[PDB]
Amino acid sequence: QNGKRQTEREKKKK
Amino acid sequence: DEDETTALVCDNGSGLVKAGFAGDDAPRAVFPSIVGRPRHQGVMVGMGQKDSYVGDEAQSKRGILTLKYPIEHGIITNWDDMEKIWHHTFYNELRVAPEEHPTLLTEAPLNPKANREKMTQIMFETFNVPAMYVAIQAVLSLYASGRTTGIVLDSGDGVTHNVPIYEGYALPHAIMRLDLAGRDLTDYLMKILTERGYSFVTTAEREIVRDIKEKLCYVALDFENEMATAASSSSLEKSYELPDGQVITIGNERFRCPETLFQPSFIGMESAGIHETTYNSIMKCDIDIRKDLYANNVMSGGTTMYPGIADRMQKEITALAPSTMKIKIIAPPERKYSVWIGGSILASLSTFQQMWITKQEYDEAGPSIVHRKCF
């Protein structure tokens, strides 16, 4: 029956 | 600009947002909870002109804008527009950065959960506020009014919450919440004035009717006698000037709209009215609670500024209440401006420093933290 915070975080952290 | 990291207080309703800092007496600025957008094609080039307008900008340029409210019946349904409203509130007029200040927001106790959760997320993610708290409107009204015990009848633009509180504690089984509010009275006034030859169906017209309501309308102490005269004589009409020079007068419609608070059937609502729900909030509490709630009917929110409303609310509940006992209403000049005032008081209490959610706990839990930490 079976975002923006991520991008700015990437910036700062890298 | 402050000499302390004082919390910012923003009383964001379905009407206007009142904002300023904790510890003050009054908001620094007030804003319509509005984001406006042009409904016309631009013809001249190099005219500036925004894609969207916020708060008072949206109201001032309203002649060609359709105006939307991100908050309906106390809940944010459009958080992108609230980010704009808060950006404006904080950076353009209060000129503060929440990044350096805790922020206090407000809501009714049975406001659907998404409201406090999205409010928490916007302030922690777009403003990166160091701390948050979402407060109860009744609590805020009780601090502003000097009480720990009473019924908070908050009949504002969004919803009427009507929650009994004793010794600072909720009596939730007795919340006589009602989906009847100032926004419905505005809609009723647009329709009843249309019947007088002054149609009000567009955004500009709606903002005008709200302004008419606030200055001309009342509830009175005795509806039937007030209408017997208002319906018979021009002596009770009052004029209003519209922006284009038109003059409108309103007769019995001046109070028949507002009367919907006591007679909800006027707009097709099935309800006992705000005074019966106030009465039941007291009655549904334990018998050793009832005496203190009868002596402390706390008026707050919008519509509290209609002539005859404080006098009428006490009359209507004392008439349902038992004899011998004294029933009293509390309706200070701080009515409706009590939620913001309470925010300033609450944010500043030393005991409230254990209630604030920090931008630490937030990251581990996410915005859902508001349901673990606020109330």
Binding site: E8, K11, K12, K13 | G46, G48
Partner: protein, 57 residues
């Protein structure tokens, strides 16, 4: 290793002051843009050479 933690956090902090001045510059750009609008309202009507061929012939 104290230095490694210091450089981690201070790299973070200089990137952060970077972004802060970046927002200062972005808002200089945007506010000075609406200010370009403001002062253009005032100064554009004269950015023109006028009354040349009126008489010379």
């Amino acid at each position: 290793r104290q230095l490694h933690a210091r450089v981690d956090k201070v790299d973070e902090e200089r990137y952060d002051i970077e972004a802060k001045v970046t927002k200062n510059i972005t808002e200089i750009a945007d506010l000075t843009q609406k200010i370009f609008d403001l002062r253009g309202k005032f100064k554009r009507p004269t950015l023109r050479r006028v009354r040349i061929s009126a008489d010379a012939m």
